[PDB]
């Protein structure tokens, strides 16, 4: 008999342990592996894929394709801001059910730059320039184009290239932010404004839609696994 | 006939490794491969034939 | 002699004919944030001379019974020229400082001041089960005053010098960077503090990186010495100031 | 708009929970061992063209205990006047007597008034 | 590498931020054509001036292995020590990960998965409520038995079938560590299939979906002491920890709640939560409004 | 070296006393200027004639690691096996080392600290007092569950939440060795901060101090047998042993007693104990006076 | 199965044990270390720093800055001893709450030389010489300068060098003394006397204060960890 | 793949060492570093620029 001392922990069952265990089927000949296309290896591969953001998540659009359309139009509306939203990828309605959002919800920490792609869906004869701005935290949301252009921004010219990318660089006091974001880990907002109205020739629709896609950049990562708030049940036979 | 590999680094910027021996006859009995970290976003973010250089127009 | 000394930062220069030495942080001179220590990704602004220079705060009077005084730090310089403006416009900031406390008297006066920089000087409330005020904590330039007795009042700091507003023995404040101004030998104190925090950068309004305390341990005294007026003046100069996360200015 | 900076109360505290704009109220208190003379709060009001405080800062004042008690057959060591907060008085018994009790008492504050701490000692022959 | 081995180096570092300065050219990285079905590869340095940052962040915890490899309850049932029902004297179910949602939604993020499984059982017993409560029952010993499809099925706690001459069984006594064992990749196919847009019958009818592909047998568990003067009841909980994983063709995470175990059925549900207007951004940073 | 490794040589010897003889010079080591903020480096040999002493004394036990690395109770709470309150059926707190003073004063000697932590739990149960005391309850099995900030919180001893598909949990049965596990340095920042002269809100208000920086989640513990004919009650005690430590900017040891957990608040307290006079030195060495 | 015997000790929980234990967070990526100034490594680094001694810990000074001031004055006071105190660094009121004292109280044994720095805070025109003496145990405290000068001492001349260091060399039968000192581990006393009064010109204050700082020398160490007597509580929410 | 280092010396002025093997994948699981004994009083007792030789005046 070799002398032994059992340490605290002996006989416990830790959900996330990682030990060897006897097989109940000695020598089972597993069926050969088959090379299926589309192998996934890290959930970040999924978060790096664009998915459509429901920016227009206003009461009444919650179950209609509108929630995905940002309304924009011909005529003088400069004072009128096109849209705006908080940058809380795992928490605010605008993002939480997004491909990036659903993934963030299985973790408690995130870090990285985010890509917001905007695509114009008006007629080809339509024209226009928009100002896409991102404001790091510390002040309230810009209330005018003047205030918004003092932060990070691109001026998007609608043309043959239907899409424009506003990249939100990671600017934070800490290396990570809570997915369940609080004021301490605030990330700011992005707002959009007419830089020079939408002009259009006769015979074409005077209003169209802009769509918005989100995805993670390559400096993005997440930590600390946890369960999602999004799924539940009252009983078995689930 | 054992294997020594490195530990995931913790609380600081040789004793940072562990040793393991398999005691069972089936690979199923082994512990998880928590240390394999490959990646290939491409399958999904960019499955276009005709390489998009993107710094160039993308259309034209 | 080594009592003589000059210091120049930006468009400003300080001189003394009666210095002790110069104390340096925990032996660390200020440095700018290195790439392998950074998280905020945007390019920093480093105003340099416009910002890293000597700002002199409003003086205080040393009376025969003054308990002491204190100042919270990044806040306190918030209205000092471009150093303050850069504070208002950025979410994150980082800086070191050269602190120069001045107090001259005469070979016939006597007294001794402890001059300390306490990193992270969280203070206690007068009302034991209440909480402080930002006002009870700092008044910008000016200076809060310690007290010779226990204080009351909701929101104010329990300021009896004896416990330094922190619940410790005032006479043990020496584990912190400091110098003494003993009137018989010395007429100023100079401490260079490096940035100290548990994160590489931080917001300068929300967090008082450190507190400067001037506490007389041996009180001011003199005779028919037609000089009863003995002021103390604090001059400080930010060093290696760098800022990140630019946006509209913060609400006063 | 806003009232001028409240300032500071010597041996006291000013609480400012709701800013210093018109309509704001600030509260005053004295440190332990000091008593408040004057108002305990001030309101920021508009009067003609000036925005000003309704009430001035009060005074926080200290306190002397009364003359210490005499004890039979003992003496107060070094008796003098003006025993302030925290100062103490000590006693000794006369030749022929032995002391029982605390040899010293201290000046404390109770309800804003100076009062001697514990009971004085007794001298027994 | 070999996805069956319990060791394998290499840090999963994210990308460094390349230092970037001012630009005036024909380069137009921020302008792409989303219609192509390609996701833009723009990084901060393509649209703003960036400093250089040596980034040490790793994606270790989001590797498929670390995401799935944590034991999850996939089933729970009860059985009594003593009763008139015979049936209530043992528990039995049909193996699947479709009866508890947490685990199910995790797996369903992938269309196909292949892996070995570490099964851990947590068994507990309680004494049933009653007027007389005094007894001195020795320790309870349980028997868990796996019946591959086609094996004879127990009809009572004392059926010959529990002889397990061949089915694998586990005998365990209360008070000891929870029972545990590894099961290899057991599929008839090359990967377990989480979705199947198909039928069981060639005439495009019969049963639709996941179920036709299942058939991994069932589990039966009973007490072995078999008795107790006063009634008692045990609950068996089974946990699955997949290990040595491989996954293919990711799909969106289930949005609507699950309605039952055999189907993918759901009720129409909201895309996300509402907010006041398309410009609504709450005001934080105020002397508290 | 690497402060993560469980081995590392070298004796921590103090200084030898250098032999010293008579002196008549301009050297004046015993005369310094304390105003500079420098602590004099004088040793006995600078002011008296000393012999040589080879000193073997080591400072091993005052190394930061050996000073903090001893398990300390940082919390204790109770929960019942059975009750009408539901709430009293499980215990829960918010992780912090601020509720038991001994540990707290030790940590607070440093402004910042970084370390891994060995957590050990001591759980005990007693049978509640009553008129009828006879029952035969099997061994109690407990469940300790950690809920990182943001996870769903249990609302009863039978909430779905205890499924721990992802939160880490420990199941343990009485009579065995106390449960134990290591937790890594878990901060959002580069070092845990013991003091924070700051606010949560940018407008210099909100919550002041340590609390705004906390947020490390909470612990929930419940019985799993869930029953007992007669009432019983358990007490859970949690111990912290930091290990692989690093500490910065030392501060004076807390002098005034602590008033509560969320603040640094205190009442004015004496610098030290009084004595008779500034010259009072008691007379020992007397034929006993 | 490999043969084993459990030894006494198995399954116990020793507060000061030192074993490996499973991590409840496999592969957690800890945040990068940051080089903060002021790293402490051994509590002795703190004890080696001067802190002010409350020598005048007389009734009535317990909460006022006086407890730190040693009164000294012009005129004839030679017979009058300036101050005196026992050398019990971890026990006597004069030292226990000192930086050195607080540290000693977390241990049961100490050994080493101690530095007492005295700083003169009178006017620059003030003058004087003092005799600082340390008497090893075995006799009662010197009652006159004659008796005191027979022991270890420095004669301090007030001048431009405001401070003077009296170093108390380690003289003991044993290598260590109890921090909770008894007569068996007595260490003696230090007393101070006018060597030649304080002289002063006209127009200057005739009385001033001398302060006293204490710190450990480099031959100082402590052993046998224990809890401090100084902190306590009556209940939780501490 | 083990490590051998020396024991802290006890009750007397080769068998004075021990061997250790790490069985876990995370550094957090390792035992304490009770054997590391560095020291740098300077940060605190002498943080003055301008080296004080002290055997010399310190002022003048």
From Swiss-Prot, chain D:
Tissue expression, as annotated, is: Expressed on the plasma membranes of all cell types that are in intimate contact with plasma complement proteins. It is also found on the surfaces of epithelial cells lining extracellular compartments, and variants of the molecule are present in body fluids and in extracellular matrix.
Describe the processing and modification events after translation: The Ser/Thr-rich domain is heavily O-glycosylated.
Q: Its domain of life?
A: Eukaryota
The residues covered by the Sushi domain are: 1-62, 63-125
Name the cystine pairs: 3-44, 30-60, 65-107, 93-123
Name the disease. Answer: Complement hyperactivation, angiopathic thrombosis, and protein-losing enteropathy: An autosomal recessive disease characterized by abdominal pain and diarrhea, primary intestinal lymphangiectasia, edema due to hypoproteinemia, malabsorption, and less frequently, bowel inflammation, recurrent infections, and angiopathic thromboembolic disease. Patients' T lymphocytes show increased complement activation causing surface deposition of complement and the generation of soluble C5a.
Q: How does it assemble?
A: Monomer (major form) and non-disulfide-linked, covalent homodimer (minor form). Interacts with ADGRE5. (Microbial infection) Interacts with coxsackievirus A21, coxsackieviruses B1, B3 and B5 capsid proteins.
Q: Quote the entry's note on domains.
A: The first Sushi domain (SCR1) is not necessary for function. SCR2 and SCR4 provide the proper conformation for the active site on SCR3.
| Family per similarity comment | Belongs to the receptors of complement activation (RCA) family.
Relate the protein's function as given in its record.
This protein recognizes C4b and C3b fragments that condense with cell-surface hydroxyl or amino groups when nascent C4b and C3b are locally generated during C4 and c3 activation. Interaction of daf with cell-associated C4b and C3b polypeptides interferes with their ability to catalyze the conversion of C2 and factor B to enzymatically active C2a and Bb and thereby prevents the formation of C4b2a and C3bBb, the amplification convertases of the complement cascade.
By what name is this protein known? Complement decay-accelerating factor
Q: Which organism is it from?
A: Homo sapiens (Human)
């Amino acid at each position: 008999g070799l002398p032994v001392i059992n340490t605290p922990g002996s006989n416990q069952f830790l959900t996330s342990d990682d030990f060897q265990s006897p097989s109940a089927m000695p020598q089972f000949d597993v069926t050969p592996e088959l090379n299926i296309p589309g192998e996934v290896q890290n959930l970040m591969e999924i978060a790096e894929v664009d998915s459509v953001v429901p920016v227009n998540n206003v009461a009444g659009n919650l179950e209609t394709m509108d929630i995905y359309r940002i309304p924009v139009q011909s005529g003088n509306h400069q004072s009128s801001q096109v849209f705006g939203f908080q940058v809380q990828p795992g928490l605010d309605g605008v993002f939480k059910h997004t491909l990036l959002g659903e993934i963030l919800n299985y973790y408690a920490h995130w870090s990285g730059s985010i890509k917001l792609t905007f695509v114009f869906c008006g007629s080809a004869m339509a024209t226009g320039k928009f100002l896409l701005a991102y404001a790091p935290p510390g002040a309230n949301a810009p209330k005018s184009r003047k205030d918004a252009m003092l932060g990070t921004h691109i001026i998007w010219d609608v043309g043959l290239q239907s899409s424009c990318v506003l990249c939100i660089p990671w600017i934070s006091q800490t290396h990570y932010r809570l997915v369940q974001q609080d004021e301490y880990t605030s990330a700011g907002n992005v707002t959009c404004w007419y830089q020079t109205g939408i002009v259009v020739p006769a015979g074409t629709p005077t209003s169209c839609s802009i769509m918005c896609f989100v995805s993670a950049c390559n400096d993005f990562s997440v930590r600390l696994l946890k369960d999602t708030p999004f799924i539940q049940q009252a009983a078995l036979l689930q | 006939g054992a294997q020594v590999s490195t530990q995931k680094t913790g609380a600081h910027e040789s004793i940072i490794h562990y040793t393991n021996i398999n005691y069972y006859k089936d690979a199923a009995s082994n512990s998880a491969n928590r240390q394999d970290f490959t990646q290939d976003p491409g399958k999904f973010t960019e499955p276009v034939k005709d390489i998009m250089v993107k710094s160039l127009p993308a259309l034209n | 002699s080594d009592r003589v000394r000059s210091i120049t930062l930006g468009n400003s220069t300080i001189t003394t004919q009666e210095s002790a030495n110069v104390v340096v942080g925990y032996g660390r001179w200020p440095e700018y944030l290195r790439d392998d220590e950074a998280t905020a990704e945007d390019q920093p602004t480093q105003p340099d001379v416009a910002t890293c220079r000597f700002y002199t705060l409003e003086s205080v009077t040393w009376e025969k019974d003054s308990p002491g005084w204190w100042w919270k730090f990044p806040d306190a310089l918030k209205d000092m020229g471009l150093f303050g403006q850069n504070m208002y416009y950025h979410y994150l900031g980082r800086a070191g400082y050269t602190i120069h406390v001045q107090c001259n008297a005469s070979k016939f006066h006597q007294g001794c001041l402890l001059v300390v920089c306490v990193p992270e000087a969280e203070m206690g409330c007068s009302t034991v089960d209440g909480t402080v005020n930002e006002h009870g904590l700092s008044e910008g330039e000016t200076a809060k005053k310690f007290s010779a007795t226990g204080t009351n009042g909701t929101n104010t700091v329990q300021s009896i010098v004896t416990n330094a507003g922190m619940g410790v023995g005032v006479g043990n404040l020496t584990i912190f960077p400091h110098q003494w101004i003993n009137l018989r030998t010395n007429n100023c104190a100079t401490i260079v503090m490096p940035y100290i925090n548990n994160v590489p950068m931080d917001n300068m309004f929300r967090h008082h990186n450190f507190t400067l305390m001037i506490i007389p341990f041996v009180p001011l005294n003199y005779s028919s010495d037609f000089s009863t007026y003995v002021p103390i003046t604090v001059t400080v100069a930010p060093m290696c100031a760098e800022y990140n996360g630019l946006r509209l200015s913060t609400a006063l | 708009k806003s009232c001028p900076n409240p300032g500071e109360i010597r041996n006291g505290q000013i609480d400012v929970p709701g800013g210093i704009l018109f309509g704001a109220t600030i509260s005053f208190s004295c440190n332990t061992g000091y008593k408040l003379f004057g108002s305990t709060s001030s309101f920021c009001l508009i009067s003609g063209s000036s925005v000003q405080w309704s009430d001035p800062l009060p005074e926080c004042r200290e306190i002397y205990c009364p003359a210490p008690p005499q004890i039979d057959n003992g003496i107060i060591q070094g008796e003098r006047d003006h025993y302030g907060y925290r100062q103490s008085v000590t006693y000794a018994c006369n030749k022929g007597f032995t002391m029982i009790g605390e040899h010293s008492i201290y000046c404390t504050v109770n309800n804003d008034e100076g009062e001697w701490s514990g009971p004085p000692p007794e001298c027994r022959g | 590498g070999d996805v069956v081995e319990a060791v394998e180096n290499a840090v999963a570092r994210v990308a460094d931020t390349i230092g970037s300065g001012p630009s005036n050219s024909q380069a137009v990285p921020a302008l792409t054509a989303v219609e192509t079905g390609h996701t833009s590869q723009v990084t901060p340095s393509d649209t703003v001036q960036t400093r250089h940052v040596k980034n040490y962040h790793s994606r270790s915890e989001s590797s498929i292995e670390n995401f799935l490899s944590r034991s999850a309850c996939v089933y729970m049932g009860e059985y009594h020590t003593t009763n008139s029902d015979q049936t209530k004297l043992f528990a039995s179910w049909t193996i699947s990960a479709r009866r508890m949602v947490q685990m199910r939604r995790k797996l369903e993020i992938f269309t196909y998965v292949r892996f070995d499984v570490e099964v851990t059982f947590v068994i507990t017993s309680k004494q049933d409520q009653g007027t007389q409560l005094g007894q001195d029952m020795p320790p309870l010993t349980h028997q868990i038995m796996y019946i591959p499809p086609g094996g004879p099925i127990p009809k009572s706690v004392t059926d010959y079938t529990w002889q397990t001459s061949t089915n694998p069984s586990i005998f365990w006594t209360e008070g000891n560590a929870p029972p545990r064992m590894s099961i290899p990749f057991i599929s008839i196919g090359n990967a377990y299939s989480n979705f199947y847009d198909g039928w069981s019958h060639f005439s495009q009818n019969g049963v639709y979906g996941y179920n036709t592909l299942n058939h991994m047998g069932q589990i039966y568990v009973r007490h072995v002491n078999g008795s107790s003067p006063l009634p008692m009841t045990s609950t068996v909980r089974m946990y699955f920890k997949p290990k040595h994983v491989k996954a293919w063709v990711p799909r969106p995470p289930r949005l609507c709640q699950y309605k039952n175990a055999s189907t993918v059925n759901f009720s129409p549900t909201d895309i996300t939560d509402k907010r006041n207007s398309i410009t609504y951004i709450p005001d934080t940073v105020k002397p508290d409004v």
